[PDB]
Each structure stands twice: as structure tokens, then as C-alpha cells.
């Protein structure tokens, strides 16, 4: 049982690839048209075109779910309108096996999504930001009961204008200190110069002390949680959790990233169920229109629930994985109706 599987997989994969290419081209064009309204003297149209071109991997990563949805719709529509699925069933091949073949096709897009997220996006995104603008300042942070302010931090491992306040467990001042310059030496410890201090004044030419800030994560502060790769996001969240309180937006980013392949597979399954169900014996244009509506609805629901997770108390896991489970159940039921 490989010839039919090979045929279905080839058709669906070619449909997905063509849809992905077309959507990437359209998004690049539309993003350029959008980024033609922010031109400045130091930011010309060529600079905008380069900025949009460098953002192509990010647009591709964001388009993969709807791309897979539309690819499944078009491939199975080509198979069905030609009355191939009817004969496939009439020889004993079940619906779930066809869905399994289409999922085999979509796993390539899932792998490409992982590769882009973990290897490609953090580089081209940085290049695009560098092009648009042309390693952090004013950074506040907490270490348990300590509050730290660093006016300038250099990822090479330097700090300028350090201020630190240490409180008692009862929130009473334990100490305060300032420093002109500082240098990381070992994990969790920094030397520094001009150590003015007060305790519950004092001065010192040079002294070391322990603080948890590390050069590794300094550059991550200016980057939005969503744009972080999975490795960077997990490492930064582990660091923050072990040393401070992790913000809810980072949890939302983590749950939205972990659920991406599941979202893609569930959307593909919904597409297949629609082809076998309501969208049987329908014009290819109608199938494409319904696929676009499903994609827009999914994106809007995902964004709205992510924000509602931020606004509301319970964990973002529910708000993120509810649509996936509900759509999977709906598609499974629609497949049960045959």
C-alpha cells in the first residue's frame, strides 16, 4: 500500500509547496507596500525592500499553518472533483488512512517550521532590524529581594552605572550600593570599581560581589518574547524562573510556540474533514474561499485568546490549547459522519 499513498502525498505536498510560495510572495509584496509609508531621509525605498526581504523567513514561518490548510484543501479537492476519493473508498481504503497520508505530507511543513524557528528566524530578523535601524541600556531587574538598575550593559560582559538595593525579608532596607563600572568574572559574580555602599557611608576602589545577571541573556531583553526562538525562550524562562518571577507574556509565548505543530496538524485534519464532509461536490473556488475564511478565523481566534490570556488570570495553556482540541474534536466528528 504505497502507490496510492505516494500519489496522495505527492499531490498534497505539491499543493502545499505551491500555496506556500504564492503566499510568501504575496506577503512580501504587501509588507513592502505597508513599509512604503515609513520612508525617511536615511531610510529609502531600497532599504525598505531589503528590510522586507530579510523578513521573508518570518513571514514563511507565520504562513505555514494556513499554507498547509489551503494545500490540503486544494490537493483533496483535486482528488475529489476527479472522483478519485470515491474509488479509493470503494476499494476499501478508509478515510482515516487518507488523512494519515495528508498528515505525512504536512509533517514536512512542520519540520520546516521547526528549522525556521530554531535556526533561521533569529538571524534574518536581526539582520532586518539592523538594516531598519542603521547591548542594552536602562535595564531594571530583580533578584529575589534585591532590585538592580544598570544604565548600560555590554554583551561582551561590561556594566556601567550600576545601582543595587538589598531588602530584608520584612522589606526593610538591608543595604544600598552604587558602582561606576563592572565586569563579569564567574557565573553569578562580577568585579566592579567605585563601590559606594550604605548598610543598616562606605566606599571602595574595587570589590567583587554576586549578582545573577549574565551576558548570555542581555541581548534577549530588547527582543519581544514572541520573536525569540524556542531554545532562547526556554533558556531565558528557566533563568528568570530560577532567579525571579517569569512574566505571563513569556508563558504565553512558550505555549503558543509549543502548540504550533499541533495547530498545523489539527488545521490540516479540519481541511480534510471539510473536503470529505460539507465541501464535497463544490467548486474549487468555493473550497479556496472557505479555506481562507478558516485560516483567518483561526489566526484571529489565536490572537484574541492569547490577549485574553494576558488580561485574565488563568494560565495561557487553556487559552492556547482550547481551540486546538475543539477543532480536532470537530474534525474527528465530521470524519465520523463520512
Amino acid at each position: 500500500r504505497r502507490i496510492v499513498a505516494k500519489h496522495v502525498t505527492k499531490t498534497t505536498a505539491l499543493a502545499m509547496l505551491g500555496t506556500t510560495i504564492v503566499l510568501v510572495i504575496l506577503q512580501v509584496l504587501f509588507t513592502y507596500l505597508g513599509e512604503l509609508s515609513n520612508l525617511k531621509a536615511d531610510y529609502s525605498a531600497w532599504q525598505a525592500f531589503l528590510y522586507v526581504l530579510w523578513g521573508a523567513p518570518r513571514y514563511l514561518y507565520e504562513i505555514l499553518p494556513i499554507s498547509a490548510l489551503i494545500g490540503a484543501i486544494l490537493g483533496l479537492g483535486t482528488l475529489a472533483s476527479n472522483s478519485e476519493l470515491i474509488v479509493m473508498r470503494s476499494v476499501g481504503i478508509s478515510l482515516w488512512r487518507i488523512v494519515g497520508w495528508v498528515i505525512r505530507s504536512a509533517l514536512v511543513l512542520v519540520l520546516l517550521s521547526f528549522a525556521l524557528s530554531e535556526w533561521v528566524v533569529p538571524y534574518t530578523n536581526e539582520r532586518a532590524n539592523s538594516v531598519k535601524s542603521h547591548e542594552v541600556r536602562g535595564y531594571w531587574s530583580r533578584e529575589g529581594q534585591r532590585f538592580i538598575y544598570v544604565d548600560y550593559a555590554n554583551s561582551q560582559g561590561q556594566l556601567k552605572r550600576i545601582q543595587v538595593v538589598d531588602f530584608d525579608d520584612n522589606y526593610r532596607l538591608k543595604s544600598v550600593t552604587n558602582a561606576e563600572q563592572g565586569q563579569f568574572v564567574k557565573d553569578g559574580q562580577w568585579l566592579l570599581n567605585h563601590s559606594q555602599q550604605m548598610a543598616i557611608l562606605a566606599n571602595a576602589a574595587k570589590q567583587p560581589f554576586s549578582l545573577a545577571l549574565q551576558p548570555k541573556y542581555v541581548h534577549m531583553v530588547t527582543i519581544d518574547p514572541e520573536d525569540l526562538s524556542f531554545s532562547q525562550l526556554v533558556s531565558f524562562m528557566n533563568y528568570m524562573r530560577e532567579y525571579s518571577q517569569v512574566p505571563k507574556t513569556y508563558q504565553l509565548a512558550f505555549w503558543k510556540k509549543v502548540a504550533s505543530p499541533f495547530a498545523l496538524i489539527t488545521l490540516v485534519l479540519v481541511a480534510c474533514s471539510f473536503i470529505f464532509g460539507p465541501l464535497r461536490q463544490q467548486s474549487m473556488g468555493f473550497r479556496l474561499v472557505i479555506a481562507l475564511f478558516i485560516g483567518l478565523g483561526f489566526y484571529y481566534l489565536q490572537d484574541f485568546l492569547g490577549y485574553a490570556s494576558l488580561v485574565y488570570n488563568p494560565s495561557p495553556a487553556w487559552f492556547v490549547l482550547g481551540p486546538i482540541v475543539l477543532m480536532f474534536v470537530a474534525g474527528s466528528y465530521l470524519l465520523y459522519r463520512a
Binding site: 531587574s141 531588602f167 544600598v176 488580561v311
Partner: protein, 316 residues
């Protein structure tokens, strides 16, 4: 009788498409605004007013596109159900059916002119005023849970925040002056179980209180002063935008042919991308007219280029 049939079908389908596109676009914008409010940058209670005020500006785009899509759908259905075949076989051509809809196109043109000349400037004036009112947010208005928020000389950290932006917990506030507080509730902000320090002075409190353009101008002003390129561009864009209804009618008539096997929805995507080509050309010829490069005359010409092109195409 055929005129009333076409008019009813087109009005029904065009209203459905207009409602659906309005839902799509401003649901997207509503979700973006909700996310911004989720970041504390905007009052979640007023964003509905923002959507209401921006209604006319999105309708300005949706109504031509909605009418175009409705015409395409109606004529595609006529072709698919062989009604167009019998209409042709009775001596009624496609161009004749397109001409029979001219009164409806004029009605839609009048409606869009009303939106363009009065409703859109009013909506964008109210929206600009409301945005200016909302943009002065600072301090506790921008506070986020488990994060440090810096505005002006103030920096705030809060450990928790309710569904409504009230009842903070674990409040830390920095200027010289430093303040800590077990609880707070919102510039008149109450702080409960808090301590104050100066950097040497110290104090305690169980309760304390802190205390820390052209697109919207009316047509009345713009009808004259054509000498200024910005006003020239705007007023030309208001005067010559409504004829996109006529251009949409004629181009939809030109591009509507489709065989029954292909389906009703086959030629929506290419036709919509041609119409979005008109829209983009216009949104470009505007930018230039403003920077004083192209001149106002370019507005009707562009339309004519998309008009004649349709008129010839329908007559091949």
C-alpha cells in the same frame, strides 16, 4: 423585471459581502486594539468607540470592494445556472445587464460620496481627538504584572493585577524617592501597607495617596486652497474616489465570465487582485500628488485607464 431581479440579487449579495468584510477587517483591528489594551497602553473600555469612529474609514474601502465582489458573484451565478445563456439567447447581452445596474451604481456612488466627504473626516477627527486623549497615559496606567515599566522619571513594578486594571499587589516605585507597598489601587492612587525612603529619610504608612490632521479636516475648509499640494491631494482623493463604484461595476462586468464547471467563485481572486491594483495605484498617485510631483489631474486619468481597459475587454 430583469432589472429588479439583478438589483435584488446584487443588493443582497453585496450587503452580505460588505457585512462579512467589515467583520473580518475590524475584527482584526479590534483584536489588535485588545492586545494593546492587554499591554496597558490603551483603555479597553474606549476601543469600542475607536471602532465606531473608524467605521466610515473602513467602509470607504469595503463598499467599493463589496459591490465589486457582489457583482462578480451575481454574474458568476448567472453563468453557472445557465441563466446567462438564455438571457443571451433572448437578445439580452452581458453589457446590457451591466447597463441595467447603472442606477444602483449611482446610488452606491452617492453613498460613498457621503462617506468620503462628511462621515470619514468626522470619524477621523473624533478618532484623532480620542487617541490624543489616550496617549498621555503614564505611570500606573502602563503598569504590567511582574515587569518593570519606566515612564519619565518614574519606574513601577507590580506583582499582580486583576482583570480590571485595579488592585495592584507588590508595588515598587522609584523616582531619589523610593516607595514600597503591599497593595495599591488606582494619578490619584491609594497605597496600603507601604513604606517610603529617601536617597537618609524613612517613613511608614498604612494608607497613602500618590499624585504623580488634513485627513480629518472638513470639506468646508478644503473645497478651496487647491494651491497647496496637500489639500489638493486630499480634496482630489475625496472628489475622485466615489467613481471607484462605477469603475468596479464596469470592471466586474468585464471580468465576470465563467464556465459552469469552473464555478461561481473561480474568478474572484484575479479580479480582486486587479481591483486592489487600482486601489494601490490610487494610494500611490495620492502620495505623489501630495509631495508635489504628479498633480491632481492624475486621479481621473488613472480611473480612465482602468475604465477604458475594462470597456475594451468586455467588447472582445
Amino acid at each position: 423585471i430583469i432589472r429588479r431581479y439583478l438589483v435584488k440579487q446584487v443588493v443582497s449579495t453585496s450587503l452580505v459581502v460588505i457585512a462579512l468584510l467589515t467583520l473580518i477587517m475590524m475584527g482584526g483591528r479590534l483584536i489588535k486594539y485588545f492586545g494593546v489594551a492587554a499591554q496597558g497602553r490603551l483603555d479597553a473600555g474606549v476601543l469600542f468607540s475607536i471602532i465606531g469612529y473608524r467605521m466610515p474609514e473602513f467602509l470607504t474601502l469595503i463598499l467599493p470592494l463589496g459591490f465589486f465582489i457582489g457583482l462578480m458573484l451575481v454574474f458568476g451565478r448567472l453563468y453557472v445556472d445557465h441563466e446567462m445563456a438564455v438571457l443571451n439567447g433572448s437578445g439580452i447581452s452581458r453589457i446590457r445587464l451591466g447597463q441595467l445596474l447603472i442606477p444602483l451604481a449611482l446610488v452606491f456612488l452617492v453613498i460613498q460620496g457621503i462617506l468620503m466627504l462628511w462621515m470619514t473626516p468626522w470619524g477621523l477627527r473624533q478618532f484623532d481627538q480620542l487617541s490624543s486623549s489616550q496617549a498621555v497615559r503614564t505611570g500606573f496606567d502602563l503598569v504590567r504584572p511582574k515587569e518593570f515599566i519606566s515612564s519619565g522619571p518614574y519606574t513601577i513594578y507590580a506583582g499582580d493585577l486583576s482583570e480590571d486594571r485595579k488592585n495592584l499587589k507588590d508595588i515598587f516605585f522609584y523616582q531619589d524617592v523610593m516607595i514600597l507597598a503591599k497593595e495599591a489601587t488606582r494619578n490619584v492612587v491609594d497605597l496600603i501597607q507601604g513604606r517610603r525612603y529617601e536617597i537618609y529619610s524613612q517613613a511608614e504608612f498604612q494608607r497613602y495617596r500618590l499624585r504623580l490632521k488634513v485627513e480629518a479636516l472638513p470639506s468646508s475648509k478644503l473645497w478651496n486652497k487647491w494651491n497647496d499640494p496637500v489639500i489638493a491631494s486630499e480634496m482630489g482623493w475625496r472628489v475622485f474616489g466615489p467613481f471607484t463604484i462605477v469603475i468596479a461595476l464596469m470592471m466586474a462586468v468585464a471580468l465576470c465570465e465563467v464556465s459552469p464547471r469552473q464555478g461561481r467563485y473561480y474568478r474572484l481572486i484575479p479580479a480582486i487582485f486587479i481591483f486592489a491594483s487600482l486601489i494601490v495605484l490610487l494610494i500611490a498617485i495620492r502620495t505623489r500628488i501630495s509631495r508635489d510631483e504628479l498633480g491632481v489631474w492624475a486621479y481621473p486619468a488613472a480611473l480612465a485607464v482602468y475604465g477604458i481597459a475594462a470597456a475594451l475587454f468586455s467588447r472582445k
